[PDB]
Amino acid sequence: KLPPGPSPLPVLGNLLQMDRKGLLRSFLRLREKYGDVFTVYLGSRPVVVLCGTDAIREALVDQAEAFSGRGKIAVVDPIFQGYGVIFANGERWRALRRFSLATMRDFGKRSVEERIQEEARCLVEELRKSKGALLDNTLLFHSITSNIICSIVFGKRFDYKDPVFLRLLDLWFQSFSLISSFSSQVFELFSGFLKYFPGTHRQIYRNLQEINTFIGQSVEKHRATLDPSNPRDFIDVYLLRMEKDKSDPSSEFHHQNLILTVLSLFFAGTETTSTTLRYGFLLMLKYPHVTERVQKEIEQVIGSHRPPALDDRAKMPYTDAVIHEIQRLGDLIPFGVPHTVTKDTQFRGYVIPKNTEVFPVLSSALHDPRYFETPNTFNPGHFLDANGALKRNEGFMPFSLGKRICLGEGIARTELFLFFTTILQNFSIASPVPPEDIDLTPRGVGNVPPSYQIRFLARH
């Protein structure tokens, strides 16, 4: 029934069938023997691995409903516990997703785009203060993407030097490092034993509990100040839907799903976006001619006075292609987020029993040599046709595909476009390291780029 793969040991599974270069290189090596679809054992748990564009498309698109289940991540499950939009399943997920999708479509008063532009203006104002001083951009890029989520859920942004904000930021971004760490990957395989002993899991738990506590306080603060005729944000809207469903005891719109849906938005909405911006500017230091062409396109379509608007992207295929290529080569979620099959499901030769975990290895699509001339080399041409127009690419699935496709895709892409262009419109860039010496190779389950310094040199 199950797809082929290495014979598992009891308890340990295919632990010893790796890892060498890494978990990605193992899967790549495993793939080269067993094919594009294979079974691997994480401890005693069987997982089906989907490799290559065709197989991932065939599962997530052509059988969308079967492959619409969400798998657990062991280090954060004790916080989420199947609540919230990311880790919910079945009807719960369906309802939270529908509500969330519909809600963020409107904001609040001012739109998400307008908030991103404002954030972009705040960023520029801030960068301008350094006067070309060296800086690591990690914090500011974590801040700007968190502020967009804060704007959406709390109806406001925080100042960049606010200690309340900075403390939460530090809390958040320690958690991501720990979640991705090798120790948490060991915890994934053997949580049942390891949950009784000290480890990264305890620290992840406390960090996320602190964040949840802050969110709970905001919720109470929102309720206490609520104008039901004028919702300010996601929480107000959710609070109003809570009231409407007050009678229905089969309603998913209760307190627990509120707290953890908000946590979910921060969990999925900050790290990947920030790192994408950080990785992007690393590439822009390594390839100044690209950066130069982007600025020329900014100057031609937008000019030097008004700020970029999302409308501009349609007229800026080169920049848009650069952003596509940044996301592709960046490959920030190489294994995807874990799925499960919602029923005994027929896939190629095989039957995947109900609730079996499935990893869609986005990386193998993003590096698919069918769709990309130069998979391992930065090449904006990958997304440009012979007329210099943006071209769609079947391999390009950084946000995944199907019913679980990134709920924030449009928000993510808008941030990417407006931040990159608003920054480059106002600043050129430099750093101590010669372009030729800049190393793009990442630092376990994460694909995190190395730290670096950059200058933002005001223009005009």
Ligand code: HEM
């Ligand atoms: C460059 C930035 C981002 C990238 C590359 C990205 C990518 C992804 C990927 C690969 C998934 C897994 C989908 C699956 O299960 O197959 C996902 C899920 C998700 N993302 Fe994003 N994301 C980004 C930013 C955001 C933002 C800004 C938001 C919200 C504003 C967001 C919200 C979510 C949510 C809620 C899910 C869970 C969807 C569900 O289970 O229904 N993400 N994202």
Ligand SMILES: CCCCCCCCOCCOCCOCCOCCOCCOCCO
């Ligand atoms: C020799 C010892 C080897 C130990 C090897 C352990 C292997 C275990 O590795 C498998 C780990 O699971 C890989 C899939 O995890 C993906 C988790 O991604 C977390 C991303 O969370 C943020 C979600 O939002 C991102 C998009 O918005």
